[PDB]
C-alpha cells in the first residue's frame, strides 16, 4: 500500500 515514487 504505497504511492507512486517519492521525492
Amino acid at each position, epitope marked *: *500500500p504505497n*504511492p507512486p*515514487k*517519492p*521525492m
Partner: antibody
Framework: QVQLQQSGPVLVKPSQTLSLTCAIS??????????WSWIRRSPSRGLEWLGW?????????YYAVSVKGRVTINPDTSKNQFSLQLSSVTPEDTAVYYC???????????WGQGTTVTVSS | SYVLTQPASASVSPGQTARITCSGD??????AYWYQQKPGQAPVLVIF???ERPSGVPERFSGSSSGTTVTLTISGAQAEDEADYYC???????????FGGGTQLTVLR
C-alpha cells in the same frame, strides 16, 4: 497516441447522482502511469481535486477528503475507460469537470475536453 | 486538512520578470508541479519536477524549488501569458494530491 475523450454536457436534478465517463486512447488504463484523475473548475472555488485510480496489481482508489463520502472512481478494463459517479449532488456541484493522466513521477500532461454539468431542476 | 497556500493575484509589465510563489508544509518532500488556466479550455502543464520544463513551453517559463516555498519565475513576460496559475503537489505519504487557490497574472500591457 494518448488522447482522452470525455462525455457530453449533463443536466442533473439537484437531489440525483452524477455519472461521467473519460475514455482513453493510446495507452492502457492499467499501466503504471497511475494517475487517471478527475478534477473540476468552479467559478470562485477554483481547481479542486477529486479522485485517483492506479493500476491492475491492486486497483487503489483514493479520493479527496472534501468529497470522499460521495465520489467513486470505477475503471472499465473492457472499454478502456474510467468513470466518475458523484452522489447526493448539490447546486454547488455545478462546475466544469475534467479528466487527466499522469506519466508517473513527473506530470499531469494529458487533459480532457471538459464536461459542463448543471445541477438544476 | 492538507493545504497548499498561494497568493491570489500577481501583476507585471511586458518584458519584465514575474515571480509567483506557492508555500506548502509538505513541499520539503513530494516534488511539485505547475499549471496554467486560460479560461475556456483545459489546463496546461508549464513546469514539472519543480524545475523541469516540459516541451512546447516558452523558455521564459522556469521555476526553482527553495524547499518549503516553490516558485514560478517568468522572464520577459509576453502579453499572451495573462492567465490564472496553479500550484499542485501531494501530501506526505503521497496519497492525496492538492491544489492552490490560484494567482492571476495581469501583464499590464
Amino acid at each position: 497516441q494518448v488522447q482522452l475523450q470525455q462525455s457530453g454536457p449533463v443536466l442533473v436534478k439537484p437531489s440525483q447522482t452524477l455519472s461521467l465517463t473519460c475514455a482513453i486512447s493510446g495507452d492502457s488504463i492499467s499501466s503504471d502511469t497511475t494517475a487517471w484523475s478527475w478534477i473540476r473548475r468552479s467559478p470562485s472555488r477554483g481547481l479542486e481535486w477529486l479522485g485517483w485510480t492506479y493500476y491492475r496489481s491492486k486497483w487503489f482508489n483514493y479520493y479527496a477528503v472534501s468529497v470522499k463520502g460521495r465520489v467513486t472512481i470505477n475503471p472499465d478494463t473492457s472499454k478502456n475507460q474510467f468513470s466518475l459517479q458523484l452522489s447526493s449532488v448539490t447546486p454547488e456541484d455545478t462546475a466544469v469537470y475534467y479528466c487527466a493522466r499522469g506519466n508517473g513521477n513527473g506530470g499531469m500532461d494529458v487533459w480532457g475536453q471538459g464536461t459542463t454539468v448543471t445541477v438544476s431542476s | 486538512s492538507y493545504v497548499l497556500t498561494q497568493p491570489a493575484s500577481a501583476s507585471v509589465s511586458p518584458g519584465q520578470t514575474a515571480r509567483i510563489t506557492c508555500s506548502g508544509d509538505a513541499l520539503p518532500k513530494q516534488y511539485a508541479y505547475w499549471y496554467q488556466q486560460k479560461p475556456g479550455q483545459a489546463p496546461v502543464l508549464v513546469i514539472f519536477k519543480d524545475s523541469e520544463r516540459p516541451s512546447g513551453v516558452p523558455e521564459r517559463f522556469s521555476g526553482s524549488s527553495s524547499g518549503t516555498t516553490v516558485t514560478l519565475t517568468i522572464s520577459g513576460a509576453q502579453a499572451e501569458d495573462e492567465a490564472d496559475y496553479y500550484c499542485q503537489s501531494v501530501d506526505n505519504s503521497g496519497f492525496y494530491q492538492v491544489f492552490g487557490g490560484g494567482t492571476q497574472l495581469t501583464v499590464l500591457r
